[PDB]
């Protein structure tokens, strides 16, 4: 039932656009764009063509009922030109779980990557090879029922669209707004998936955070006020927990964490290099209040796509200004884990993690 | 800053639709309302034939939900009047819902001039048989071209009109299942936003798939009856202190606060009867009322279907009958014969905003 990539049509621009010479993150778009159209017939041929508008009917269910999930990858150019996914396996899997989700309609993931595949194929000048830019790419699943009752569309739109980035100067830390008025998503909820529907409500609380003079929120949850996210990033402490032994800990998936591609990817780079623990585990603000008291913490930071591992340095919490002292450790495990992953990213060491297109 | 409907262009339709049993909101009328915001502000609004929308890939209203609708409707009385009811709480809430995504403000009474002209042009598709009316479909999104999760710098607003027919005393089944939440506390279920309705539609074919017609929305260890659907709850009954009253929960960030629910409290109170009140509500008070024979009715309360009275709820496996028919229904019979004088123009009110 699932589009086939043997099925690509291709439509070459004759608008082609100058290349960038101040990349902005997700403002500047390529040449082309996948689209596949769903509907009572099943999915049409998917196809590469010129970079364009959608035009929607007016009722279209991803407009006002918010059927829309989304994805994020990057690929990289080598010096040999190679260009190369992350890890986009596990993006196609999480994207089929999102659709799901919102009872969209299923695609096969190995014909979606190949379609991609061929989509950067035909935009690889594009991708960038100066050192940290690099292709973010960006599918998307909406519904496109032309109805205003709340039910299961029966046609939808599948597209991709890509983007060149630099850097989202990748080890400049940030602070931290810690309120527990402002809560990202629940158990039971859908802030384990990549939908649109969890983004656009944490505009205002940016908004907030910045009036109190911190760059982004740090999202509690609970009556323990656990440290779930921080911004659209997951969040990882590297410290000496309340047993002792030396440790790096990240929230379980519990249901109020994005499983992201670098968290996961960061958890077992840590495992394989067996030289501390690892371990996924609640943490709460009590729990990290006490260990910076007591000098046991030694780096905080937030792993996504975008922006990779970002340093934290300060939470303002309870009226009350913590010092993170992120930078004071180097930060020796962001900094350790910045190289390796760009050592694979950009093909330095041959790794499975990395698809060729 | 906001548009002026003293600025509005007119396009009338080339190409008019042939108009129509309807079913609630696949048919739409001939026109359209628009109005784009950019750097510069509002754009002039904007009265056009029904056409496509055209969004730039990037859009913010497609990746990060920013967007956010209404709902109300407009009824034509025998002499061919038409008007709206209580508008103005429509587009307050809908301001609310503006300033919750950090989407452009606008001047309320500007955008319901623009409305009413929409509606003027389209009177012809009012429809004007007993429970019949006009649902209008206000919209506001976001449409910055950017993939960072930004307050936008380009909005859309539009507006479009379905006739429609009932949707109005055929009792449902709820499927009550402490596992789905609606909304949380400190979360945007208050909101009449995008992003409360797509994670619903699983959970309603999950009810479908267990017999039930459509999801009694619990909350909180004590599980709370919220929401039904997406219309507000009302239980009509003798509480455990023994005083008849109608009870709906409390707005407490879970509840979006309705425009039928407000009418509904606002009649009640006015006739003085009863004791009227906004307080939670348990499945264990619910148990226990049933049990002892002093619930009355349960219903839902929304715009597309007015007054909805329930029978069942499946809490679980365990069957719970309602006797809501039982008992006339003479409350909700009551408050769907008041609402028709007050909507169909019988009884001057004013609560009816004139076409
Ligand atoms: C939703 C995926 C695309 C995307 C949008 C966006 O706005 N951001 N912002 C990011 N990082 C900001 C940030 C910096 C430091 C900390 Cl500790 C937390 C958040 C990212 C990423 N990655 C991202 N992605
Ligand atoms: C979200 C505004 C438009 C809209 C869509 C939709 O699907 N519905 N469904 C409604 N009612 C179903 C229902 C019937 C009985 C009970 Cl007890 C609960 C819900 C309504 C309405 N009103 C509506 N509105
Ligand atoms: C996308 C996302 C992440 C993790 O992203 P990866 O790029 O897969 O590592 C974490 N949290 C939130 C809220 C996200 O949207
Ligand atoms: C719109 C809405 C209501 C109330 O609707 P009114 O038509 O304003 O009475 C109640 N609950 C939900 C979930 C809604 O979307
Ligand atoms: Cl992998
Ligand atoms: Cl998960
Ligand atoms: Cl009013
Ligand atoms: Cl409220």
Redesign the pocket.
């Known amino acids: 039932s699932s589009f086939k990539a043997a099925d690509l049509q291709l439509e070459m621009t004759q608008k082609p656009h100058k290349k960038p010479g101040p990349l902005v993150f997700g403002k500047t778009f390529t040449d082309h764009m996948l689209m596949v159209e769903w509907n009572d017939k099943g999915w049409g041929q998917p196809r590469i063509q010129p970079f364009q508008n959608l035009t929607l009917h007016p009722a279209s269910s991803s407009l ?2 918010s059927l829309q999930l989304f994805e994020g990858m990057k690929a990289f150019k080598g010096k040999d030109q190679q260009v190369r996914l992350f890890r986009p396996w596990l993006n196609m899997d999480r994207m089929l779980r999102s659709a799901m989700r919102l009872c969209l309609p299923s695609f096969d993931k190995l014909e979606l990557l190949e379609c991609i595949r061929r989509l950067i194929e035909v935009d690889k000048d594009w991708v960038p090879d100066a050192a940290g830019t690099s292709l973010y790419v960006r599918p998307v699943l909406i519904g496109n029922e032309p109805s ?4 299961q569309p029966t046609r939808a739109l599948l597209f991709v669209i890509l983007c060149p980035v630099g850097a989202y100067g990748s080890v400049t830390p940030v602070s931290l707004l810690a309120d527990p008025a402002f809560i990202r998503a629940w158990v039971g909820g859908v802030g384990n998936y990549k939908l649109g529907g969890n983004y656009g409500p944490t505009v205002l609380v940016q908004q907030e955070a910045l009036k109190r003079g911190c760059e982004q929120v740090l999202w509690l949850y609970g009556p323990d006020h656990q440290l779930t996210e921080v911004g659209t990033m997951n969040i990882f402490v590297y410290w000496t927990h309340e047993d002792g032994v030396l440790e790096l800990v990240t929230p379980p998936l519990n249901g109020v964490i994005l499983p992201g591609v670098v968290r996961q990817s960061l958890l077992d780079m840590a495992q394989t290099w067996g030289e501390f623990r690892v371990v996924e585990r609640t943490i709460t603000m009590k729990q990290l209040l006490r260990a910076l008291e007591e000098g046991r913490v030694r780096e905080v930071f937030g792993s996504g796509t975008a922006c990779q591992v970002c340093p934290v340095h300060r939470i303002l919490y309870k009226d009350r200004n913590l010092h993170i002292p992120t930078m004071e450790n180097g930060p020796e495990l962001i900094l350790r884990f910045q190289k390796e992953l760009k050592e694979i990213q950009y093909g330095i060491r041959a790794h499975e993690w990395m698809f060729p297109v």
């Open positions: 006002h009922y205003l009752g709340v039910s």
